[PDB]
Design a protein. Sequence first.
Lengths: 50, 297, 342, 50
Amino acid sequence: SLSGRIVGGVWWFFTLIIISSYTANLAAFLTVERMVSPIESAEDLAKQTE
Amino acid sequence: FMSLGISIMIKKPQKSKPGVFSFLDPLAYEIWMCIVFAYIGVSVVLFLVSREFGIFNSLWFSLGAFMRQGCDISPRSLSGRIVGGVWWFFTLIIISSYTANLAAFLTVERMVSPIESAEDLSKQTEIAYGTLDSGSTKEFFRRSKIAVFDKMWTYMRSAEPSVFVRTTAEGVARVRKSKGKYAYLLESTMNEYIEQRKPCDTMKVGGNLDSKGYGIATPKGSSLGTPVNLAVLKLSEQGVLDKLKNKWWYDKGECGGSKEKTSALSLSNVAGVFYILVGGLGLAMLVALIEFCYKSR
Amino acid sequence: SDGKYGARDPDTKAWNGMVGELVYGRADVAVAPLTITLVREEVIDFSKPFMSLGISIMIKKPQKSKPGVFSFLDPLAYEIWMCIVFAYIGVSVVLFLVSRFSNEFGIFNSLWFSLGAFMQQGCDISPRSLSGRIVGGVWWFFTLIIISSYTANLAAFLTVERMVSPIESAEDLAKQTEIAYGTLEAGSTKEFFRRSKIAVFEKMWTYMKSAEPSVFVRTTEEGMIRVRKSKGKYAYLLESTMNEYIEQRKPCDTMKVGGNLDSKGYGIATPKGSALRGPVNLAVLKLSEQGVLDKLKSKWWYDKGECGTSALSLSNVAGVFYILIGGLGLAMLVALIEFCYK
Amino acid sequence: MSLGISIMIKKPQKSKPGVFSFLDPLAYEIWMCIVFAYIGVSVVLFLVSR
Ligand SMILES: NS(=O)(=O)c1cccc2c1c([N+](=O)[O-])cc1[nH]c(=O)c(=O)[nH]c12
């Protein structure tokens, strides 16, 4: 029916955004985490304040 | 011995709050509307191609196709399967393109300034701008030949309310408190010093408007004013003036490493889609009730 | 007469050019773009400065990168897109054979099942037998890897593209080797560079001395051509005033970038012991404060000139719309053919 | 024996990942509201369907 279809369509639009947001955020989480360098040389000390 | 001019200062751009419908940021507003029109076209064509599939039934098929869920509606005609398969390929690229662009936003964040130049805040006409009550820069604004500052003096004079402060220290305080609502105009020299000092919440933007300079003053006659004028010119060439200005401005300062960390998503930025859900649910109840109500009579 | 700015020979003090004509006194005063130095201040009397100059950077203007009309098929190479089509045929044919053997999977339906799997849009009918199931399972495993590889590669493509910075300040020049930079063969620019006691401009000149080809160019105008020829591989340092004018007049493929580095001013000169210093020096200040120079500088540079959101654009996806329309075009023709037949 | 000036930092401790370090992308208050919405969607669907 028409009443059953309209509630189904919004639940479909809800799903597609929640899933894609979860994937992209996890992609950003692992990308940042692996491109980090520890304080190795004296040059690294020279350009750090924290 | 050094040159200067009148420049613009604003509060640091910082980070915005995402309100509602902030999830439509990855794609342009042009593309979204094109998808709406296109899906009507595909639905209409499917009906005309066929002559079961009506107007209502065809529209549902192409909605279920874009959301990427499998129903029980399948075009059995050869002509319809050319339509269906082509519409499927569209769906696959749009979804994949969305996901990719959203990942780029949350990897590296760019805070971009709202205003670029003096001609920018001439057109924007949103954020307040003025000078001191009475000074050198105030007198410059009053008497102007060119149209751009003449239009600016029109704003400065007939301001509601008057955008004028007593001290230059008051001007800086008004910029930080307003939070992107007031832009102060003063000398470029002081502006660069205030940016380097604590706690760092303002920066220089654009070029200078006029060109002035400081010098060494000496009484009339000037019997001893000749040699010291020549010596400064030589020390300008050697690069002692640049060395000394670099020591007090830049060397001795509060803020100088940029370390970014990805934070978890809060409810506020996804809030948009939640209102759409419950709104659609309430609408479904309304239509079902009146469909029964007039069927009874 | 000479055509030079003003320089004295080291042997004989024979001043050539503009200042040379002033020293003995052929002319009263001079109005020319001439810088002030300690050397020049002794022999000729300089007035107050009217226009301030500085050393700035000139690169080739980044051309408007119009995206390819099919710039959405970049992640995967052409030979892969070829082999997906070949495999798609081979899968359907095999499925068709093993399904019906002495079945709903006809030649038409088995072809429809294979597309539905790759596009990720479910299915109408599932394979019933063992032979049909095993070929279906591998085609499912193929699909899941190809799709996910395409999404991840496009994610990497856009991530890198947005985190790039152009050569803005002199610090960016100091830490770059790919984009070369050089000045004139001889002048006030290179002379400043030698006795430069700065932060990292001493390191800048250290690199300039030892280069593979000759970075120093003889002519200034020919030096501008070298930047054009390189196309974003060479940068030419010069005065700011000359740099801004070169962008305006002549074909537009250049621009100024960054702030001024050095401090130097033009002036108006007349030999010492002149009574003309009084009214002229004050007149210069009268012009500047009221704003005569600033209006005049606007005219000859700009008025008499011959030049002049970061979401996913429509152009990047534009291509896939042409596929959508072309498909519906064929769809109408198929309806046209089989109506005349029946 | 030869000597030199060197750097001494605190040793990076063995970062044992959380046993539920896969629900980091989305915050706790979102995961709560997905469950609430899921019930509300089903009940409304059930009513207007029959
Ligand atoms: N044409 S140029 O490329 O820009 C240029 C190149 C080299 C030296 C210049 C110079 C200009 N200038 O701006 O015409 C003025 C100027 N004035 C002086 O007093 C001096 O010593 N050297 C110069």
